[PDB]
Amino acid sequence: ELPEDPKWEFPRDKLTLGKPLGEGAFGQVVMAEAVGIDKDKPKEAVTVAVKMLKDDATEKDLSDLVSEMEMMKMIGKHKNIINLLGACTQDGPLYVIVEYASKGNLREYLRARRPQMTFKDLVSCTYQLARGMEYLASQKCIHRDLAARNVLVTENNVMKIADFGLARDIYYKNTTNGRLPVKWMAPEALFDRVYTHQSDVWSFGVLMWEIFTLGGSPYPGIPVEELFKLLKEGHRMDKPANCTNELYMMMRDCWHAVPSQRPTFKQLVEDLDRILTLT
Ligand SMILES: Nc1ncnc2c1ncn2[C@@H]1O[C@H](COP(=O)(O)OP(=O)(O)CP(=O)(O)O)[C@@H](O)[C@H]1O
Secondary structure (H helix, E strand, O other): OOOOOOOOOOOHHHEEEEEEEOOOOOOOOEEEEOOOOOOOOOOOEEEEEEEHHHHHHHHHHHHHHHHHHHHHHHOOOOEOOOEEEEEOOOEEEEEOEOOOOOOOOOHHHOOOOOOOOOOOHHHHHHHHHHHHHHHHHOOOOOOOOOHHHHEEOOOOOOOEEOOOOOOOOOOOOOOOOOOOOHOOOHHHHHOOOOOOOOHHHHHHHHHHHHHOOOOOOOOOOOOHHHHHHHHHOOOOOOOOOOOOOOHHHHHHHHHOOOOOHOHHHHHHHHHHHHHHHOO
16 A cells, blocks of 8 residues: 655565564564665665564554655755665565664663763764754754654764654644643644744753753653643753753753744754864
8 A cells, every 4th residue: 555666665585674672652663684775785784773563553653654754755864863774665564764773762871871971972962963953954854852762872872863753844733632742842832833943942952951961851740731831931940960051051042932032953053063172
């Protein structure tokens, strides 16, 4: 039932599934070996990650996995985003083949290095993620689910933005009864059901907070049900212990009530470049 797309199709006999990397909401991800998936090296086997449906998959899971695949097709290549490598869509189960990150997600990566991480490492991480998001915004893509659990870390410690299941090509009108994680969402997205690049910028501020707390959970002790009201009233998180004033002012700026008053990803890249260049 899935229409052909030769540019992205990859032969099943060149794909060898291996160890499971983890299951989530609507699917499963497994490590695999793909032979010749790098066209400029057709005989090499490269370790990749494959996203597929589970046995208890719903019809919605299938269209979601397809929709996620289609987003990643139009996004483009970049060092700081998990990139689509290919797909097996014909004569069998849907396999979405993406770059493999051996060190898992940033949240767990940071939590397991709690006392090891230097301050500059954290600034580097933040810088890389700002770059991925700058590129992403330049492709007119809003992520809508930016968070530490959705960043993946490679063997060489490159930060890669992942999980494009909620990403959209663009204002955008969010649906009522939202499917966006509340603690990472800008007030516009939550209250006005609108989404812009500046909405991702707010999420990035929460991402910054996660990074400098070495994987802390945002708005600790505050139930999701009460968070809506507090944000209206101007509630914001505290400065993490391991954070300069400069970097804290950056977070607070990403958390400006007025979207146009928040920095752009290009601005954040500029500032983070400067801060990294020192340090
Ligand atoms: N390209 C990749 N390389 C290595 N591990 C990956 C990966 N893609 C996903 N994973 C891992 O497989 C698991 C499933 O992620 P998935 O995105 O499919 O579900 P999910 O989004 O509901 C969990 P989360 O919301 O925290 O990202 C995750 O633990 C993730 O760390």
